[PDB]
Amino acid sequence: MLDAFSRVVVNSDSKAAYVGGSDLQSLKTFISDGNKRLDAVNCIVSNASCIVSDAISGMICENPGLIAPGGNCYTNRRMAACLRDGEIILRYVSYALLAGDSSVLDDRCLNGLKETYIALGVPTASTSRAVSIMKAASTAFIMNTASGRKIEIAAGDCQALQSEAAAYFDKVGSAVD
Amino acid sequence: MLDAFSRVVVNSDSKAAYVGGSDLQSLKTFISDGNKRLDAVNCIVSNASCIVSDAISGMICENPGLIAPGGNCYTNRRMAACLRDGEIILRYVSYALLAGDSSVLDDRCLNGLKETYIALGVPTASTSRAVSIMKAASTAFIMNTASGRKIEIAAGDCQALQSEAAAYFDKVGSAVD
Amino acid sequence: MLDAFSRVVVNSDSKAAYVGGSDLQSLKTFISDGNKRLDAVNCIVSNASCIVSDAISGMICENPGLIAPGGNCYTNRRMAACLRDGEIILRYVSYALLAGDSSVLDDRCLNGLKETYIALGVPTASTSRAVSIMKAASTAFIMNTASGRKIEIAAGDCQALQSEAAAYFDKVGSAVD
Amino acid sequence: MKSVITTTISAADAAGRFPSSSDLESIQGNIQRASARLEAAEKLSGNHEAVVKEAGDACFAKYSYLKNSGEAGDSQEKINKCYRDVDHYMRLINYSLVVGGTGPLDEWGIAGSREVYRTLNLPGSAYIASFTFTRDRLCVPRDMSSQAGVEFVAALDYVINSLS
Amino acid sequence: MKSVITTTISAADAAGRFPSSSDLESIQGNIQRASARLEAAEKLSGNHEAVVKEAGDACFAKYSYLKNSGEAGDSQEKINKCYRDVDHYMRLINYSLVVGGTGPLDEWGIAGSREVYRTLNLPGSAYIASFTFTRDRLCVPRDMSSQAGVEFVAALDYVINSLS
Amino acid sequence: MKSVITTTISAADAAGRFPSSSDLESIQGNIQRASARLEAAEKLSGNHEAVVKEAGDACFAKYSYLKNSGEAGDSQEKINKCYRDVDHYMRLINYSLVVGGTGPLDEWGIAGSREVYRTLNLPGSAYIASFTFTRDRLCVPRDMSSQAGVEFVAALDYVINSLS
Amino acid sequence: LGTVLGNSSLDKLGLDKFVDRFEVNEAGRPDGFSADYEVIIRACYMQIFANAYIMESERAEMAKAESEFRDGRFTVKEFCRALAKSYQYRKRFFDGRPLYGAIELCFKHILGRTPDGLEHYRAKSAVYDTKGYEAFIDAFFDDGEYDAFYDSYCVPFYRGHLTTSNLSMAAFTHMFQVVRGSSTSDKANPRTMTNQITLNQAGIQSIPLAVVAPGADGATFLAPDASAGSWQTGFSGATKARTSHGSRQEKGKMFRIEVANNTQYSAVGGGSGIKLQSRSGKFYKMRNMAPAKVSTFRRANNVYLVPFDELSATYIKIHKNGGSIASITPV
Numbered sequence A, B, C: 001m002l003d004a005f006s007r008v009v010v011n012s013d014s015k016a017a018y019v020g021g022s023d024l025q026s027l028k029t030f031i032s033d034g035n036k037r038l039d040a041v042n043c044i045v046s047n048a049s050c051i052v053s054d055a056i057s058g059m060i061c062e063n064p065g066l067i068a069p070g071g072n073c074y075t076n077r078r079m080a081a082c083l084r085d086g087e088i089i090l091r092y093v094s095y096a097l098l099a100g101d102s103s104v105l106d107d108r109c110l111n112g113l114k115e116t117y118i119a120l121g122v123p124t125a126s127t128s129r130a131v132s133i134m135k136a137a138s139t140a141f142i143m144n145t146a147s148g149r150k151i152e153i154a155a156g157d158c159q160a161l162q163s164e165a166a167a168y169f170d171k172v173g174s175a176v177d
Numbered sequence D, E, F: 001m002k003s004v005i006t007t008t009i010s011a012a013d014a015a016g017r018f019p020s021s022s023d024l025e026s027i028q029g030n031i032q033r034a035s036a037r038l039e040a041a042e043k044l045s046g047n048h049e050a051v052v053k054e055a056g057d058a059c060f061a062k063y064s065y066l067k068n069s070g071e072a073g074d075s076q077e078k079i080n081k082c083y084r085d086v087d088h089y090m091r092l093i094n095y096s097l098v099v100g101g102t103g104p105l106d107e108w109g110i111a112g113s114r115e116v117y118r119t120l121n122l123p124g125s126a127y128i129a130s131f132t133f134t135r136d137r138l139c140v141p142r143d144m145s146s147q148a149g150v151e152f153v154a155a156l157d158y159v160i161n162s163l164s
Numbered sequence G: 001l002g003t004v005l006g007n008s009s010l011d012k013l014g015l016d017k018f019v020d021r022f023e024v025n026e027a028g029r030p031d032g033f034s035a036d037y038e039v040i041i042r043a044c045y046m047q048i049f050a051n052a053y054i055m056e057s058e059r060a061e062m063a064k065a066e067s068e069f070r071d072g073r074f075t076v077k078e079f080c081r082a083l084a085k086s087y088q089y090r091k092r093f094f095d096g097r098p099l100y101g102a103i104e105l106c107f108k109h110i111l112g113r114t115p116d117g118l119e120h121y122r123a124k125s126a127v128y129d130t131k132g133y134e135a136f137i138d139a140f141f142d143d144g145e146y147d148a149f150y151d152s153y154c155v156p157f158y159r160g161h162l163t164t165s166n167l168s169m170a171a172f173t174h175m176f177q178v179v180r181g182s183s184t185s186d187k188a189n190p191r192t193m194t195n196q197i198t199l200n201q202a203g204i205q206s207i208p209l210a211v212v213a214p215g216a217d218g219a220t221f222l223a224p225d226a227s228a229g230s231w232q233t234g235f236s237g238a239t240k241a242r243t244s245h246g247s248r249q250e251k252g253k254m255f256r257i258e259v260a261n262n263t264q265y266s267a268v269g270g271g272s273g274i275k276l277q278s279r280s281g282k283f284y285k286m287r288n289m290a291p292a293k294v295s296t297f298r299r300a301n302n303v304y305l306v307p308f309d310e311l312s313a314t315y316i317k318i319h320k321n322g323g324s325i326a327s328i329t330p331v
């Protein structure tokens, strides 16, 4: 695992050079954007099982063939493992938002997963559908635009961070497809 | 692992309906043939180490190269593992006679075996020879036609079941080749 | 493991009430004394190998019978385990200074140690001697009065915390005897 | 899939010794109770529709609060999900009823029921209302047989004790 | 018991190292968020009674079917069980709120809640109604502080997401 | 690599939990001590050359026997090995100083140093001489700020205590 | 129970349940059935946590590793390693325990024997101190021992009692101190609960321990601690000594008898029901015909060394006081 700090150090490490000015200045922007990232991860962590609920229910409600007999959601067991997979995807996404770098996701969740599914037969476009719903759902929670929970936050602009989280979810969705 | 019951239920489960009368009637024929299957499996379990004795001793005495120096029966250790392997083959065949379905044998004994003998270097035509000897010897014991033991049984015809046991042994012999 | 927060929570939990204002006021004094505790732990952690060096070198140089043939420091292996023991004692004491509570040390380091040293043949009075040397040497580093390393700290009073660390080391020295 | 056959073959297989006379006695008992179980499977395959209709209608003859705000009553569709879930339950009661162990019912239905029911906000108590209703609505010599009814009750009891 | 202190001490302990400066930065943040969390702990210790009374009264401002047949409403005793359960919950929100991690609330309350709630036929959804009521009924500068309100909401969220 | 971020992600991950408020307080502390650490990193990146030159020149202002027979003074090349090793050390103090744990400094530089230094007959005491020289030669209000100085001293202390 | 009767002396030692063995015999990934695996999984928790209690909340911990056993990822060797690395296993066994309590547990969980000599303890503690925790766990798993006995598809079992992994007779007796029959788990079992090292003094010096069967007679007996006399000054009244040297070996061999429940209410002086010192309620024994408030037996569980010709008498007196006899081994 590597955060933003570690990535600056690894990239600067190859040339055997010190942190310098520019890299540290971009990382100063990370620190000043710190609390926004903190409260953002609090927004995605709170109501996260509700994200997984809405996402998978939307995946079945959009594509009714999964619950059709012989589908990959068709069994109570299968639905359990389905919900857990959504939960673990969101889990490592949450860690990628804390770290500010996709190292934990790439090294730990992303690896081996496309092939695991191929053996399983899990439909990959349905998984990328569920990942997309967790993406939009997660960005709507992160922008205080949830139609059910519009909680109090310090007022500001955080479009950078929304683009960041959308980059991680698009990394998972491109990883399964 | 799946018996006859399980296979009817699984086929009707992908069919997604109730079990129904028709499958049930064939399984009633299984039940009424029950005790014949029972005494058949008693016939194969009794005198089975004698089957493996005769089988492997026939496999060496047909093909004298195994016991020749540098063969796969040539070591006393190798002869031990040879005898045991014949015993385990016979064992799972006996289970496939009890269950009335080859699921235990296909999932458990048949799978990975061709790849294992090949890795070992075990000659495959010799194994299919030994499987064939266990086949015909086992059917002759199961039909009370053994030249050494013609024991007392209730009178009847069991050609169905002989065809069944011959199907299991042919499945293993085709599996190694 | 339990810090000072956990001790307030457990005591108020057996008391079965809310934490309340009063306990919280003493814990506010803990938080306002926080940075002194931070710099204190930094003082004991920095130059700690040097503390273990001075302590055990003092224990041998005061009592020359340990290194005598037949002593418990007499073997190179034995001297290794001797040095490590001093290191681990100071390690858990350092944890007890961060937590502000002796839970880690009592549950983990303190328990069964007299019967272990007795069980090995380690003289207990000599261990309490070495623990006492780490006590005084650690308090002299924590008060910036070290004759070799007098580093810069902003000036204040920290007698509370010195009494605390002395309480942990006296707990260990009474624990081995 | 837990049946008498798979149990004894699995156990004697784990032991590693040819199937002895004990397993033979076990499958002897399986072919003894067979006719009773299949009788109950035949009648369940007969009248499954009215079974599920009375089960769901009795489930809302109890708790009405589900179709209020909404917990689960906000469509004819979700109530159709109710009746299809009871269809799946009687389908697995039919399957287990055929096999004669609680194996198929456990591996298809019961394994991992909880994560789903706590996650997708499904109260189990209403399922319990349905099954206890049907379990109360047997007929001893009027419906099937002494052996068939008992068998049916056993299966259904397993469902409720797996759920409550 | 998960706090900042026990996490970093446990981690560096599992490494086998003395505590380095990284742990010290973590507990530096603990002494930064401390005053906000303890403020929220103080106010909850202030008005805990009315908190639990409005929580239970809002729990039965929702689902009335509980006090019917009976599920759990058959006495003033069982409703006393209700208000003491929410007393335990706000008391653990207070404990975790003091410590500042969801450690105590998880190990005292949440660990093994679900087998009790499925075993004693207790619907968790009503708890959810209570806590989401309280969580909706904060006040930004009227009640505590920007950071304290956030801390309190976080703890209560954890409860709901541990339960739903 | 030990930082606050990787410690709490790794620990929360080992729990299997989403990241709770405790980790959030830890990274809150990281962004509290950040400016001090980065200040020290800026000035180290500033005059690293004269730092390494005075460190090595002071390393041979102590032990001169190195450049004798030979241990390690038998070329301008081996003394270049000396100053490049001190270049690597100040480069890792810079790296760890950025990250804010002794993680990078330990995993790159310290881990397995001992077998190399005993294998290539490199005495560790000379390194100690260099670093204790630099650590003695800072300036309290003259360089950086009370807080940055402390951070720098901490890192470099770790090096000496990792090496002796 | 009884070592004869049905021929199976070991089963009645409490180790009858642990015969069950669990080797995956199915090659290739499971899809759907999840019966056999959920059994093997459960057996892994029964071995690794040693019958500790894990809940739905606690089933969320290690859910990922659990979902990797079910896939072509981990052998049960590597799955057992993955359960041994996790948050739970550290909470229970490592964080509460001392490095030697913890070492001894790790052999009960991973290998199912006890450590015999101090050399095992030195090796594993040194691996710990060099590298930390995860390499500690690896150093159990990554050795010839585990690979040979289990082969990576067998869930670990108790083999410390068996004669086939040789060990020492000390490891035999120590085997039964560590396992007390099916209910007792690492947390639950007395003298191994939480932090206390299950056997330090015994485990370090390879002291054979008399084996007391579960249930039976004095199951609830924990040995009284001894100090070392002059050197490292210690109390000298607490227990009988394991050795008995002689000139009292006359009168027949010395029997070290352990008595297990001593109590005021039980101690009667041979005559039924509690005797009253004063007319109105005063029950402790009078010192010099003055009331004392000191328990007649002071710390449940005193031992007795008794030579053979005094056995019967001693055997009577224990039963007079209602003390119950744990184990009687000739010394």
Ligand SMILES: C=CC1=C(C)[C@@H](Cc2[nH]c(/C=C3N=C(/C=C4\NC(=O)[C@H](C)[C@H]4CC)C(C)=C\3CCC(=O)O)c(CCC(=O)O)c2C)NC1=O
Residues within 6 Å of the ligand: A066, A071, A072, A073, A074, A077, A078, A079, A081, A082, A083, A085, A086, A088, A089, A108, A109, A113, A116, A120, A122, A123, A126, A127, A130, G030, G031, G032, G064, G065, G066, G067, G068, G070, G071
């Ligand atoms: C660390 C990351 C990580 C993941 C991302 C998952 C990925 C994953 N999923 C499954 C396994 C599974 N995953 C699903 C999920 C699905 N159900 C459907 O209807 C959909 C197509 C899909 C959800 C969108 C199902 C149903 C199974 C079980 C498949 C089966 O047994 O038939 C398995 C095999 C092991 C198991 O059975 O659990 C793995 C490795 N596991 C991990 O360790």
Ligand SMILES: C=CC1=C(C)[C@@H](Cc2[nH]c(/C=C3N=C(/C=C4\NC(=O)[C@H](C)[C@H]4CC)C(C)=C\3CCC(=O)O)c(CCC(=O)O)c2C)NC1=O
Residues within 6 Å of the ligand: A032, A033, A035, A036, A037, A038, A039, A040, A042, A043, A142, A143, A144, A153, A154, A155, A156, A157, A158, A161, E033, E146, E147, E150, F024, F025, F028
């Ligand atoms: C320990 C826990 C912890 C947190 C949870 C955060 C909470 C937090 N957020 C902000 C502050 C803020 N938080 C947000 C966040 C956003 N505003 C929007 O309108 C979006 C909905 C949302 C996107 C994430 C913004 C925009 C600010 C103010 C701008 C800024 O401070 O950068 C502040 C500054 C102080 C204050 O406002 O009083 C703090 C402490 N920090 C912490 O230390």
Ligand SMILES: C=CC1=C(C)[C@@H](Cc2[nH]c(/C=C3N=C(/C=C4\NC(=O)[C@H](C)[C@H]4CC)C(C)=C\3CCC(=O)O)c(CCC(=O)O)c2C)NC1=O
Residues within 6 Å of the ligand: B066, B072, B073, B078, B079, B081, B082, B083, B085, B086, B088, B089, B108, B109, B113, B116, B120, B122, B123, B126, B127, B130
């Ligand atoms: C569960 C099912 C199951 C099987 C079917 C066997 C299959 C099997 N056989 C061997 C191993 C072996 N099998 C044989 C058998 C042979 N000797 C010959 O002369 C003939 C070609 C052939 C008998 C017809 C021999 C000789 C070995 C040992 C090979 C060697 O070590 O050289 C091995 C490797 C492990 C071992 O040495 O035992 C395995 C997995 N094992 C199982 O677990």
Ligand SMILES: C=CC1=C(C)[C@@H](Cc2[nH]c(/C=C3N=C(/C=C4\NC(=O)[C@H](C)[C@H]4CC)C(C)=C\3CCC(=O)O)c(CCC(=O)O)c2C)NC1=O
Residues within 6 Å of the ligand: B032, B033, B034, B035, B036, B037, B038, B039, B040, B042, B043, B142, B143, B144, B153, B154, B155, B156, B157, B158, D021, D024, D025, D028
């Ligand atoms: C527990 C052990 C156990 C057994 C070993 C069997 C023994 C067994 N076999 C039959 C009964 C029988 N067994 C056979 C078997 C055959 N007859 C032939 O001529 C062939 C040689 C042979 C092929 C296998 C036949 C044909 C019957 C009678 C037909 C039938 O009952 O299906 C019966 C019926 C009752 C009776 O005949 O008195 C029983 C109990 N059942 C058991 O429970």
Ligand SMILES: C=CC1=C(C)[C@@H](Cc2[nH]c(/C=C3N=C(/C=C4\NC(=O)[C@H](C)[C@H]4CC)C(C)=C\3CCC(=O)O)c(CCC(=O)O)c2C)NC1=O
Residues within 6 Å of the ligand: C032, C033, C035, C036, C037, C038, C039, C040, C042, C142, C143, C144, C153, C154, C155, C156, C157, C158, E021, E024, E025, E028, F033, F146, F147, F150
């Ligand atoms: C991350 C690492 C880390 C540390 C190592 C500490 C370092 C630290 N110490 C103080 C501050 C201080 N430190 C001390 C300490 C003492 N003074 C004495 O004369 C005694 C010798 C010594 C006993 C321990 C005192 C007295 C203060 C000032 C009083 C106070 O702030 O409480 C401050 C306040 C800010 C400043 O002074 O600029 C900081 C950040 N905090 C951290 O975050």
Ligand SMILES: C=CC1=C(C)[C@@H](Cc2[nH]c(/C=C3N=C(/C=C4\NC(=O)[C@H](C)[C@H]4CC)C(C)=C\3CCC(=O)O)c(CCC(=O)O)c2C)NC1=O
Residues within 6 Å of the ligand: A057, A060, A067, A074, A075, A076, A079, D059, D066, D071, D072, D073, D078, D079, D081, D082, D083, D085, D086, D088, D089, D108, D109, D116, D120, D122, D123, D126, D127
């Ligand atoms: C093989 C067995 C098997 C089952 C037993 C079911 C169980 C089951 N039910 C639902 C899903 C559902 N089940 C119900 C049923 C309920 N409506 C209520 O008012 C009552 C509380 C209850 C009937 C008694 C509803 C309403 C949903 C949809 C829930 C929702 O989307 O909000 C789902 C999720 C997938 C879906 O939406 O269909 C599953 C797995 N499915 C299976 O494959």
Ligand SMILES: C=CC1=C(C)[C@@H](Cc2[nH]c(/C=C3N=C(/C=C4\NC(=O)[C@H](C)[C@H]4CC)C(C)=C\3CCC(=O)O)c(CCC(=O)O)c2C)NC1=O
Residues within 6 Å of the ligand: D043, D044, D045, D046, D047, D048, D050, D051, D054, D134, D137, D138, D139, D140, D141, D142, D143
């Ligand atoms: C496959 C499983 C299966 C069941 C479990 C039953 C369940 C069942 N019973 C009835 C219906 C009925 N069940 C009974 C039975 C009796 N009522 C009494 O008061 C007696 C005590 C008891 C006989 C012992 C009666 C009398 C009716 C018709 C009237 C009624 O509802 O009670 C109905 C409605 C259809 C009908 O009228 O037949 C259904 C679905 N049917 C099935 O097909």
Ligand SMILES: C=CC1=C(C)[C@@H](Cc2[nH]c(/C=C3N=C(/C=C4\NC(=O)[C@H](C)[C@H]4CC)C(C)=C\3CCC(=O)O)c(CCC(=O)O)c2C)NC1=O
Residues within 6 Å of the ligand: E040, E042, E043, E044, E045, E046, E047, E050, E051, E054, E137, E138, E139, E140, E142, E143
């Ligand atoms: C320590 C934590 C803590 C809380 C979470 C609150 C919770 C709380 N709020 C109220 C009570 C109240 N809370 C509010 C707040 C407001 N109502 C509105 O409609 C506005 C939107 C909102 C301000 C933003 C109001 C107006 C009342 C009184 C009337 C009411 O119940 O709404 C009460 C009853 C006692 C009273 O009247 O004060 C309690 C327990 N109190 C605490 O001590």
Ligand SMILES: C=CC1=C(C)[C@@H](Cc2[nH]c(/C=C3N=C(/C=C4\NC(=O)[C@H](C)[C@H]4CC)C(C)=C\3CCC(=O)O)c(CCC(=O)O)c2C)NC1=O
Residues within 6 Å of the ligand: E059, E066, E071, E072, E073, E078, E079, E081, E082, E083, E085, E086, E088, E089, E108, E109, E116, E120, E122, E123, E126, E127
């Ligand atoms: C340390 C934390 C802690 C808790 C949080 C509680 C949780 C809890 N509640 C109950 C038990 C109970 N809890 C309730 C409460 C309810 N009544 C309803 O109408 C609502 C659904 C709900 C209040 C919102 C009731 C009614 C019972 C008794 C249930 C019964 O006996 O039927 C029990 C079983 C023991 C008992 O009977 O008391 C437990 C463990 N106990 C604890 O030790």
Ligand SMILES: C=CC1=C(C)[C@@H](Cc2[nH]c(/C=C3N=C(/C=C4\NC(=O)[C@H](C)[C@H]4CC)C(C)=C\3CCC(=O)O)c(CCC(=O)O)c2C)NC1=O
Residues within 6 Å of the ligand: F059, F066, F067, F071, F072, F073, F078, F079, F081, F082, F083, F084, F085, F086, F088, F089, F108, F109, F116, F120, F122, F123, F126, F127
């Ligand atoms: C990333 C960090 C990093 C380091 C810190 C260095 C550390 C280091 N130094 C040497 C190797 C060396 N280092 C020195 C240095 C010394 N000469 C002396 O007189 C003094 C005692 C000392 C300088 C103070 C010398 C002389 C060698 C060569 C030794 C030899 O070949 O005899 C080697 C072996 C490989 C080589 O020959 O270069 C390594 C790994 N390398 C790294 O990759």
Ligand SMILES: C=CC1=C(C)[C@@H](Cc2[nH]c(/C=C3N=C(/C=C4\NC(=O)[C@H](C)[C@H]4CC)C(C)=C\3CCC(=O)O)c(CCC(=O)O)c2C)NC1=O
Residues within 6 Å of the ligand: G228, G229, G230, G231, G232, G245, G246, G247
């Ligand atoms: C009937 C036969 C019989 C014996 C043979 C002795 C053996 C014996 N010695 C000691 C005890 C002792 N024995 C010694 C003797 C030693 N001092 C050393 O420097 C040497 C290694 C060694 C003499 C060669 C010492 C020093 C003690 C006291 C040990 C202590 O308290 O630390 C004890 C314990 C009781 C006690 O303290 O006296 C016993 C049983 N006792 C017996 O009843």
Ligand SMILES: CCC1=C(C)[C@@H](CC2=N/C(=C\c3[nH]c(C[C@@H]4NC(=O)C(C)=C4CC)c(C)c3CCC(=O)O)C(CCC(=O)O)=C2C)NC1=O
Residues within 6 Å of the ligand: A050, A051, A054, A057, A058, A059, A061, A062, A132, A133, A136, A137, A138, A140, A141, A145, A146, A147, A148, A149
């Ligand atoms: C009929 C079958 C069906 C569904 C099921 C939904 C599922 C769904 N939710 C979405 C997206 C979505 N879902 C939620 C979560 C959700 N909203 C909340 O305010 C609360 C409290 C929630 C959990 C209870 C949010 C927050 C969003 C983002 C949009 C928004 O701002 O609401 C999106 C948009 C995806 C995208 O942007 O690519 C879809 C498709 N849609 C369907 O057609």
Ligand SMILES: CCC1=C(C)[C@@H](CC2=N/C(=C\c3[nH]c(C[C@@H]4NC(=O)C(C)=C4CC)c(C)c3CCC(=O)O)C(CCC(=O)O)=C2C)NC1=O
Residues within 6 Å of the ligand: B050, B051, B053, B054, B055, B057, B058, B061, B062, B132, B133, B136, B137, B138, B140, B141, B145, B146, B147, B148, B149
């Ligand atoms: C000279 C090298 C040599 C051998 C060794 C034998 C081996 C042998 N046994 C056979 C077959 C065979 N073997 C036995 C078992 C055997 N018979 C019994 O009655 C008892 C008690 C037995 C164990 C002691 C039976 C029961 C049969 C079936 C034929 C029969 O009815 O006897 C068959 C026929 C295979 C087939 O049908 O394809 C062969 C080749 N043959 C050889 O040429």
Ligand SMILES: CCC1=C(C)[C@@H](CC2=N/C(=C\c3[nH]c(C[C@@H]4NC(=O)C(C)=C4CC)c(C)c3CCC(=O)O)C(CCC(=O)O)=C2C)NC1=O
Residues within 6 Å of the ligand: C050, C051, C054, C055, C056, C057, C058, C059, C060, C061, C062, C132, C133, C136, C137, C140, C141, C145, C146, C147, C148, C149
């Ligand atoms: C001949 C066998 C022998 C020894 C070995 C020493 C060991 C020793 N160090 C002490 C105490 C001691 N030791 C140090 C640490 C030490 N001093 C420094 O300035 C630096 C850099 C150190 C590590 C290299 C300090 C700082 C003190 C406190 C006294 C002081 O101010 O120096 C004390 C006093 C203990 C007390 O106060 O109770 C002793 C006995 N003494 C012996 O008789």
